[PDB]
Design a protein around this motif. Sequence first.
Motif, PDB file in Angstrom:
ATOM      1  N   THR E  16      16.795 -18.740  12.261  1.00  0.00           N
ATOM      2  CA  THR E  16      16.153 -18.987  10.974  1.00  0.00           C
ATOM      3  C   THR E  16      16.224 -20.467  10.609  1.00  0.00           C
ATOM      4  O   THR E  16      17.313 -21.035  10.500  1.00  0.00           O
ATOM      5  CB  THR E  16      16.803 -18.150   9.857  1.00  0.00           C
ATOM      6  N   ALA E  17      15.848 -21.451  11.471  1.00  0.00           N
ATOM      7  CA  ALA E  17      15.845 -22.780  10.868  1.00  0.00           C
ATOM      8  C   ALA E  17      15.246 -22.746   9.465  1.00  0.00           C
ATOM      9  O   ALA E  17      14.206 -22.121   9.242  1.00  0.00           O
ATOM     10  CB  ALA E  17      15.076 -23.764  11.748  1.00  0.00           C
ATOM     11  N   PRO E  21       8.721 -21.047   5.787  1.00  0.00           N
ATOM     12  CA  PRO E  21       7.918 -20.053   6.503  1.00  0.00           C
ATOM     13  C   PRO E  21       6.884 -20.688   7.432  1.00  0.00           C
ATOM     14  O   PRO E  21       5.869 -21.209   6.966  1.00  0.00           O
ATOM     15  CB  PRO E  21       7.234 -19.274   5.377  1.00  0.00           C
ATOM     16  N   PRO E  22       6.880 -21.747   8.103  1.00  0.00           N
ATOM     17  CA  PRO E  22       5.510 -21.756   8.620  1.00  0.00           C
ATOM     18  C   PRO E  22       5.168 -20.493   9.406  1.00  0.00           C
ATOM     19  O   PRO E  22       6.032 -19.928  10.081  1.00  0.00           O
ATOM     20  CB  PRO E  22       5.487 -22.988   9.531  1.00  0.00           C
ATOM     21  N   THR E  26       7.159 -20.839  16.362  1.00  0.00           N
ATOM     22  CA  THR E  26       7.623 -20.204  17.591  1.00  0.00           C
ATOM     23  C   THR E  26       9.147 -20.114  17.610  1.00  0.00           C
ATOM     24  O   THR E  26       9.836 -21.107  17.373  1.00  0.00           O
ATOM     25  CB  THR E  26       7.137 -20.971  18.834  1.00  0.00           C
ATOM     26  N   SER E  27       9.656 -18.880  17.509  1.00  0.00           N
ATOM     27  CA  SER E  27      11.094 -18.639  17.574  1.00  0.00           C
ATOM     28  C   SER E  27      11.617 -18.804  18.997  1.00  0.00           C
ATOM     29  O   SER E  27      10.854 -18.706  19.960  1.00  0.00           O
ATOM     30  CB  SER E  27      11.426 -17.237  17.059  1.00  0.00           C
ATOM     31  N   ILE E  28      12.858 -19.095  19.131  1.00  0.00           N
ATOM     32  CA  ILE E  28      13.503 -19.238  20.432  1.00  0.00           C
ATOM     33  C   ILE E  28      13.475 -17.903  21.172  1.00  0.00           C
ATOM     34  O   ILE E  28      13.919 -16.882  20.639  1.00  0.00           O
ATOM     35  CB  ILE E  28      14.956 -19.743  20.290  1.00  0.00           C
TER      36      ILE E  28
END
Lengths: 51, 102, 115, 50, 51, 50, 51
Positions: E16-17, E21-22, E26-28
């Motif tokens: 959750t950086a 919200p953008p 792209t999540s890890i």
Amino acid sequence: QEQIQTAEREIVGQDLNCERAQDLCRRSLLLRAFNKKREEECEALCQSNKK
Amino acid sequence: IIQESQRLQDSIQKEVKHFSAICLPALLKVSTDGFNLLPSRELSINRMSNTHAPYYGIFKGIYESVRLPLYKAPESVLSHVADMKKQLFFLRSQLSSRSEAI
Amino acid sequence: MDEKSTKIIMWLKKMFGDKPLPPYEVNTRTMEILYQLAEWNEARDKDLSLVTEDLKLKSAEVKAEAKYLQDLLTEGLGPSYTNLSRMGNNYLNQIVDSCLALELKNSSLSSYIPA
Amino acid sequence: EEEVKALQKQKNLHIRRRNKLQMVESGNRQMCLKSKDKEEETGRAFQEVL
Amino acid sequence: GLQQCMLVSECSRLLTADSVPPSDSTSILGLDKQDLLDLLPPNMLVLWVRD
Amino acid sequence: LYQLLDGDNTQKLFRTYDGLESVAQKLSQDIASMRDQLEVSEQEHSLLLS
Amino acid sequence: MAQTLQYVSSRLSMLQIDEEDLERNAQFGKVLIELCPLLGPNGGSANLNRE
């Protein structure tokens, strides 16, 4: 005082930071979660092949 | 289909290899001014938090050079150096006074 | 002598602001003392400004980390970690206050003992 | 005499604190060895996931 | 139970950086917070561990 | 920290961490050197008095 | 005059001021007393010390 200072330097040097073990645990958990997602994706391709 | 299937060939292995090279703590971003996310490891307060932090060896050397104990909070380093400068000025003044007195 | 004199007059104007500079005996000795004082003040003012700005930055960084740890603990341990017994809270406050009193980096024994 | 008493008290104190430190140090040394074993276990679990 | 709760929490945060919200980030490993929450022990065990 | 130690706004275009440690060592050496000079001066004074 | 010296020496510990300096220069002594509140115990400006 010289003995206490030597012992202090040793304790400070032993400051067990199990950061490596913790990092591995984090990576393991993330990869487990990744594996689960990829298994779901494999199941979806299997369904397409059946068709 | 052959072209798209080739793109996804060994896709899991490719991703895992790139993941194994990443530093996880670099992902922990905190906002100090609400706008700029910086990795927590780059915060000045964490330079001495962990023996594995990138800048720990350099700042350990700076602490020892200014005779600041390693258990002290990082926020004390500038105040301490300022006091040392104050002391230097005082010692110079004392030397000058004593040299004049002699 | 004319340069040192200018520096002193400018410095006194800065220190006394809108108040008329008080008349004083301008001799070689009074000028030397004032000059040393002006140099010392200027050098210290610079040092204090740098320390003050840094402390502001550190206050922001500590605040950000505090929020991070609080969120981490809330998500991991639940809100119940904040519902400690009266004695539990007392013990926590004493550790915290002891660490603040010794200006420690953290609450570890490796920091407390040498301090 | 008071100084001698005060210094003796201080000496006793330093001796007690040294002993305590030696205990903490022995305890930490043991903990550090065991933590290395954990690192090896977690390293195996990580290889299983791979 | 406790180790697993802390690890999940630590890893959730890695994902959750707190960034904004953008809707497009792209999540890890393509993992979302929900993918990790699934690896938590059963809710009855989590409450027991917290008490 | 570098500004606090070097005093000289000499806009050094490239500040290094090694440079920072060196300037910090210098301050400590200056203080030590000043204390030594003061001690010498104190001996000189004591000889004169004797 | 001795009181003025003590006051100035305590607040401006760096200044080497002798009694002869204040006897020959009475108006200068007044200036130093007025400067003492403006200068903090450490030689810095009182405003900056407050900040």
